[PDB]
């Protein structure tokens, strides 16, 4: 698992041909936003810290890559 | 604040001087290379220090390394930050310009 | 009804001992009918199998170490004085040996001896 702090690199990782899964984590107690992408051999997580950039990133992610929000109380 | 870079100063190579207090401090002991140049970010409290092979970006509010950028160069001569703060230009003695 | 099986499965699923599992006496029939770890979880949720709380447990120097500590503090004080320039190298060495010997007993005594030496 690797950390990402740059949005363009997260975009290119998501555009990689083997980018398998994606999810968005919102931690409201620490007002933090994470975008996690599963890209075969690593899991990458971008730390955003801002909701405006979170929305812009969600709009800018590739359409084929189905972005989704992870729910509470995982089954 | 004004920062000075002395290549042969070893662990005293980079020094930030606060003029309002006449205080010279050396915040970053380890630099992983011979320091060549340094600059302040245009709109955010980050410090770029360029040694012979890399440029290390340091947040000054935490005094912590936030980034390392590695131009494909042998001996970095100069660098410059965009007024925007998201692009770099690196000129090196290997006759190669690198836009980052 | 025999409830050894239910006792063991309930302890295993509740992560406690067999002495901490409690089966409802009035519902022995339903507990006996339960014979799977999903049915026993259903009973645990329903309140017929209960994990009891833990039992109340109400709670309400060698001369080697002395010498080591006194030597460390004395040597630290000599280092501080020699670094602050109160003493010089040779008087520092003299005090070093004299304190290694049982001449000094405490920091203040060292201090008055330094006063006598310098005055």
């Amino acid at each position: 698992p690797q950390e990402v702090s740059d949005i363009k690199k997260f975009i290119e990782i998501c555009r990689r041909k083997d980018a398998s899964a994606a999810r968005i984590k919102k931690n409201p107690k620490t007002q933090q936003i994470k975008f996690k992408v599963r890209c075969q051999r690593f899991l990458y997580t971008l730390v955003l810290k801002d909701s405006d950039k979170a929305e812009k990133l969600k709009q800018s992610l590739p359409p084929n890559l189905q972005i989704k929000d992870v729910p509470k109380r995982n089954k | 604040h004004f920062a000075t870079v002395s290549p042969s100063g070893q662990r005293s190579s980079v020094a930030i001087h606060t003029l309002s207090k006449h205080l010279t401090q050396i915040p970053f002991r380890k630099l992983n290379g011979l320091a060549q140049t340094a600059s302040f970010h245009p709109l955010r409290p980050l410090f770029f220090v360029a040694t012979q092979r890399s440029i290390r970006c340091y947040d000054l509010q935490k005094l912590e390394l936030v980034k390392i950028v590695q131009p494909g160069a042998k001996w970095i001569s100069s660098f410059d930050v965009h007024p925007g703060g998201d692009n770099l230009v690196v000129g090196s003695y290997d006759k190669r310009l690198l836009w980052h | 009804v025999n409830l050894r099986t239910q006792k063991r499965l309930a302890a295993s699923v509740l992560g406690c001992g067999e002495g901490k599992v409690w089966l409802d006496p009035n519902e022995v029939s339903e507990i006996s009918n339960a014979n799977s770890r999903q049915s026993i979880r259903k009973l645990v949720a329903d309140g017929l199998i209960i994990k009891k709380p833990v039992t109340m447990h109400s709670r309400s120097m060698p001369q080697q170490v002395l010498w080591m500590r006194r030597q460390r503090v004395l040597r630290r004080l000599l280092v501080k004085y020699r670094a602050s320039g109160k003493i010089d190298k040779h008087l520092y060495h003299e005090l070093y040996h004299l304190a290694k010997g049982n001449t000094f007993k405490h920091k203040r005594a060292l201090v008055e001896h330094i006063h006598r030496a310098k005055a």
């Binding site: - | 004004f2 000075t4 002395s6 001087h17 606060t18 003029l19 309002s20 207090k21 006449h22 205080l23 | -």
Partner: protein
């Protein structure tokens, strides 16, 4: 040789050898008021 970015003063910082000199060059843009403000900025950390 580098200039102090602020327009409120006229301060030049040079590095020769192992020394850094902060200087006030004589230029027909420095008023008496601008000069005194610059000198106050320089000798404002002597406290």
């Amino acid at each position: 040789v580098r200039w102090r970015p602020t327009k409120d003063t006229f301060i030049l910082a040079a590095a020769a050898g192992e020394d850094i000199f902060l200087m006030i060059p004589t230029h027909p843009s420095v008023t008496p008021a601008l000069d005194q403000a610059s000198r106050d900025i320089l000798n404002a950390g002597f406290g």
